[PDB]
Symmetry: D2
Subunit: 399 residues, 4 copies
């Protein structure tokens, strides 16, 4: 365990090895951590647990900190298995202990653990739980940030916001605090997290932060459920989220494609050359989706004013990894971004139009598509470079 502040004790778990979250949909190249907190005032409160894979360790470690029967209340901000995953093993030892959570969390907790007999206590925004010594917890519902069950818990006096997933990041380090870790790595992990997980809930971010601030509660620390506790200039992460939620983009274009014989790759490289020659302000990145980290592609899309996506025609349809990434983007809801589809074909083609239609349906504002037959010769590569120049001109930011 590690002291957070006063009588707040981090009793979580670092996970150096973990490389896959949500099946294989989110790759954690710097591992992760699962933060749980024990507050010891007149009442003893446990905030969240840890991933199910560490259930045994979590309960044994908690015993080393406190006799389990001395825990008064358990707060579950969110019932995804990376936070409530040790709850069944803990509850087996202290079956009657009250659990405080949102109404939706009863559904999600029962959904995973199947113990509807536990003593649940529904909390709504503004509800309070007194823990003594002039301190209390104030609950704030945050539905769809990022699950229906989600909430945050604020501790008065100590002025700590327990934000669960919000403001967190998958970044394993033995140091608990934000000022103690490498800043470049920290912020890279924060942005990858927002881009890949929170983008579709962006419309909910500014209203919820606005609501919380209107409570006029001081924030000395933000203790999230993943990665660092924000204790040096904690509002920095809040301000980033406000920037990130507003249909964020930089002067940046991302190009990604799949290819069977490199023809669409040659088109992509020519497009990039045309962009770079025409508007040097623009940062350009190119990825082969079959050979690159998918989450890195999506973080780039999030950061970009526009994208070009490429596929050849394969059995009259799109290449499968491109079809999958377009499905995924549809669910992520990127906004205010432009796109252009491109690709090669051997005879009747069709995949480029099929792709451009799905990109439009995903919310991208479409420019003209670029098509070529078989392998582009010198003449065709010139047309590909010009497509890049024309896309750069059309998408250029104001001087």
């Amino acid at each position: 365990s590690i002291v957070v502040k006063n009588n707040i004790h981090w009793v979580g778990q670092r996970d150096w090895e973990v490389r896959d979250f949500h099946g294989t949909e989110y790759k954690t190249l710097r591992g992760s951590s699962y933060n749980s907190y024990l507050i010891r005032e007149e009442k003893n409160v446990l905030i969240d647990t840890v991933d199910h894979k560490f259930s045994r360790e979590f309960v044994q470690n908690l015993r080393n900190e406190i006799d389990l029967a001395d825990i008064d209340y358990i707060v579950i901000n969110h019932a995804e298995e990376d936070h409530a995953g040790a709850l069944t093993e803990l509850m087996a030892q202290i079956p009657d202990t009250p659990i405080y959570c949102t109404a939706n969390a009863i559904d999600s907790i029962n959904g995973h653990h199947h113990h509807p007999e536990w003593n649940f206590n529904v909390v709504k925004t503004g509800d309070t739980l007194d823990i003594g010594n002039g301190k209390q917890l104030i609950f704030v519902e945050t539905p769809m940030l990022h699950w229906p069950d989600s909430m945050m818990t604020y501790l008065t006096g100590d002025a700590v916001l327990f934000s669960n997933d919000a403001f967190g990041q998958h970044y394993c380090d033995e140091h608990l605090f934000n000022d103690e870790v490498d800043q470049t790595e920290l912020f890279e992990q924060c942005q990858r997290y927002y881009a890949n997980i929170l983008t579709p809930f962006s419309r909910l971010v500014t209203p919820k932060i606005t609501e919380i601030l209107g409570f006029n509660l001081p924030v000395d620390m933000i203790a999230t459920s993943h990665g660092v506790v924000w204790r040096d200039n904690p509002t920095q992460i809040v301000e980033l989220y406000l920037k990130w939620a507003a249909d964020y983009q930089e002067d940046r274009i991302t190009i990604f494609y799949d290819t069977m014989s490199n023809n669409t790759r040659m088109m992509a490289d020519a497009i990039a050359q045309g962009i770079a020659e025409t508007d040097p302000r623009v940062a350009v990145k190119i990825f082969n989706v079959a050979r690159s980290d998918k989450n890195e592609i999506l973080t780039n899309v999030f950061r970009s004013k526009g994208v070009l996506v490429g596929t050849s025609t394969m059995n009259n349809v799109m290449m499968p990894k491109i079809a999958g990434l377009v499905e995924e983007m549809t669910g992520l809801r990127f906004r205010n971004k432009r796109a252009s589809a491109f690709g090669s074909h051997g005879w009747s083609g069709g995949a480029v139009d099929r792709l451009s239609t799905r990109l439009q349906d995903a919310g991208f504002e479409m420019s003209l598509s670029l098509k070529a037959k078989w392998r582009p010769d010198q003449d065709a590569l010139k047309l590909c470079r010009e497509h890049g120049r024309e896309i750069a001109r059309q998408w250029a930011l104001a001087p």
Copy 2:
């Protein structure tokens, strides 16, 4: 080089290392080979080249066999880069050498190599090229088996059918002939090849084989462009293709899914238990698409009377790898097969219906979907097992 028969010399390339074809769409776990043949009669004829990656070796090796200027004719059955990939380097040495190919192959050859000045000679089915000593080549067009440019070349007297991709397989071995290799491995590779590449052209297979047989030409050997030369009971591969083309299926069900927290996996396992208990005749296979070889999944689909496909709901859409595999299956055109969609959701769901509609559009005859919320408890697992029992009963073959 290796003697095929009489004056036919294999001058190809074995590829022990290759693991990816068509980008990463076809995984060659036993490597591959690229067969090219040099026939030396009164005229010298080269049939096909090899993959572009071995262009230097191919030309140097061919020089070891024959002075390049002594080659009279070049036959290109098919211009995909794994067979015509060394053509530019060869043609640079002997620029005026005549090339015999289909009309469509002029387009595809020019498409890849950009030398429209080469001396192309269009051949149609039944056209002949005399090479002396009472032998000649007879060309047979085979459009869309598997490209518009595809054809086969038959050599009279020696009675050898050069079938290019047809009847071939990706299976690297130093032994050239079918009777010289491991039979289980050979036939596994043949079926994986047909299932993953030729399924969508199945309707063309029986008419083309019927046409070729109606020529009343003896076949002593079938010399393909990948893997073994069929010289012991060569019609065995032809008969397999006739079986494979007729909307082939065995008494077999394939279950595949993706999952973020294992809920859909639990459903899949319960379904399988219900099937196995109800109809023991049925071979059942289960795959997590995020953790398994995709081509092996598709070979199983090809072999199956039906499939169950599973996904959870992720950001109101399907899991991406499932969306991609459904796109791919749509292009493959499986026929006479049944399906049932299944999966878990947390709140409003939607992915199962989205999946079932796309499976129907891909040609599967749909049975009822199976849905569950969060993690299935004992009661829900019973419903999943019963879904399996009911699917087994509905899809059962006649006693």
Copy 3:
């Protein structure tokens, strides 16, 4: 659960998804299963549990079969986590239940579970446990097949040998019995298992099987801890093990290497051509260790009369993946096999001699090494082919 025979009930777990065992040292491309058996006579006996990852399911499923308090005895044949992994969760419900195991298993069980207070009962070979109705269990110690704690348990009357890891295989199927599954796949998985895991204990295999047979106990079934129950001609797997233990080899040579710029790959391919031309009886396989399944390489080594291993020189040492595989082979103890080291270098070299010395130390009988500088030209490739011809002649089996 599934009936094995009479009152023996399979209460295990199928694992369709698992792809890695022992870290990543053993890849299970066809999944696996964990077999546990409940015998219900006058006494109720549980034989083994399942992998720790399925602990919750195992106990819940066992409850569906029997009230936990009705279990009289628990037999633990082997305490590796894939079999005793659910023991802590089970013992928490029935703390006083007697456990029967070898002396060494007390050490290994306490080693993993840390409950030395459990009621252990040491069994030695020939000890018996009466379970009523004229049936009893007879224990047979099998130390280092494959752990110090290992044993088998034989059930009289029903004539079932519970062999735990021995005779098992990682092969997931819903059908329990050997006659119900695909035979090619079954035997492939059995051999991969023996080659990769049991080879170093081969010297113990023939004496232990000899001892068991000398008991004159009928064997109607062999119920292992992984994969199928052998009930049709069960001695078939026993006879295979006797063949496999006797320093098994076929007329087969395996070539494997790593390479930075393909020079050692070119040497390997030339060597193979020389072998194939010289002794057509020999099955040859070639693997790039950086691009191939390591367990498949080792299964081939096991099946081979000899191996050639290749590395270039990298920073005055061997390429790392080759150093690792030689370490692993040293621990596996291959016997009666021949080897030859080969590779390329740029200047002073040294890796080939370094490799040949380690192969000798691993137990291989060494033939001359083959060395080349940079990329082999035509002359050097001739020398590589001749090395193959000479190796084939030297290692040839009798006519």
Copy 4:
């Protein structure tokens, strides 16, 4: 092509897709590029070519820039295939063109291309080649930075140092200059490159840089063979190399291991906790070698004052991936670093001592090893944490 300065034209190749160099020994997660330069004064000089995979493109692109017959001289700084890989295709068009290179480069060029008839001109340090308009090239031999053939070429007047591999990095971007790319990414790639490739030649770095500076030649730009041209404060990369060569280390400890059942992982995590609690100045990183990027582990080792390496005992030897990484480290020659070996065992063990001996032989100054049996309980984890505390105290930097 892109203008570098005055009459110097970049005529290289960007490689967005490439992910593997030197087999799979160096992973390029941000791609790479191959820089070649054409200088057009009174004489026309080509400096280097590009990777063999882009040979066709390179020659076609060069034709677009200049008639091949107008090239006067070719300079080959280094004959590895990523730079001289297009030389055979270029030389086929202009066979008589003089090549300037080191004596050793004749051996390496002939080694790869097998055209000893080409007109080679040996250059030694200080030799000059006049190209007119008051400019000339001055050659500087740099043997073993990083091959025997390596050299740099300096262009007077324009004051550009063509350093080939030295000062380069694998970092693909359409922008050519150092001030035009993301600085964090650039410097990350520079350090990964030095750590993984140049560490063993560190002793040669300070003398060669000292020699070059003693020439009193102004340096306006450093045009390397990979990544950016250094044109803004170009000496920044030179100063980094001087820091990196001096047995570089930060206040940082790297822990890495392999594990079959997570016991050694538990030890590693406890060790890390002890370090972090004892000396908060120290940055700690932990990697499972079977699940992490190997080059990232080695970059961390390079940056570290010490390492702890972990393995269990497997068949009386070390786990193979650990044996391979120790072989690789032996060749890399890390200096002034401390180490401690650790790991778990089941019975007789031996792998930890085996590992500690090899680490000592690799140049690490050894502290005591840490050993545990099976899975560490609470008592054993305390000993592991204390090992961490004791290692932190011993290795602490001065206050």
